[PDB]
Amino acid sequence: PPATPQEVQFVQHMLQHHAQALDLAAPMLERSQQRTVRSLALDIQLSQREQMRQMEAMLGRWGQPPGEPISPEHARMMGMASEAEVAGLSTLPVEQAERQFLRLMIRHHQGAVAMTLPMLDARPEVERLARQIVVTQRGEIRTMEGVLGRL
Ligand SMILES: [Cl-]
Numbered sequence: 001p002p003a004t005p006q007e008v009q010f011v012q013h014m015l016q017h018h019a020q021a022l023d024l025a026a027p028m029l030e031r032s033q034q035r036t037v038r039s040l041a042l043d044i045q046l047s048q049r050e051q052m053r054q055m056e057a058m059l060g061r062w063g064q065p066p067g068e069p070i071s072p073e074h075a076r077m078m079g080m081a082s083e084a085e086v087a088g089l090s091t092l093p094v095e096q097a098e099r100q101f102l103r104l105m106i107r108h109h110q111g112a113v114a115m116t117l118p119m120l121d122a123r124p125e126v127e128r129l130a131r132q133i134v135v136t137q138r139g140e141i142r143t144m145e146g147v148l149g150r151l
Pocket residue numbers: 049050053
């Protein structure tokens with residue numbers, strides 16, 4: 001049976017949501033001199049990309065396009081960083097940019113969890129993906145909260 005419109009939209013939106021994690025990590029790898037922050041940024045890039053590859057494959061199998069872009073207001077509700085917030089990671093003094101990176105990525109991951117919980121009650125591969133997203137996001141949030149506390 002084909003993926004439902006809700007399942008298709010969920011994957012389309014999550015693929016774009018995950019992509020932003022890469023935009024947030026890039027300035028840390030460019031600017032931070034903290035091995036702690038750099039290590040964490042790399043790890044999040046790798047975990048988000050693994051899930052993006054799964055989402056891309058799903059959309060390909062379903063013969064569904066990528067979503068239309070998310071609107072700024074709706075991106076904000078999803079916990080995504082605004083245009084300005086992402087730019088701050090490149091323009092703010094580095095120590096402030098590191099803290100902002102963690103705050104933005106935490107809020108980002110909280111939005112991902114909140115988008116995903118309703119999908120736990122779905123087509124098996126979507127349920128599996130949803131569970132993986134929630135587990136991974138929650139692990140990374142806990143690490144980021146620890147790092148933010150130690151900075
Ligand atoms: Cl990749």
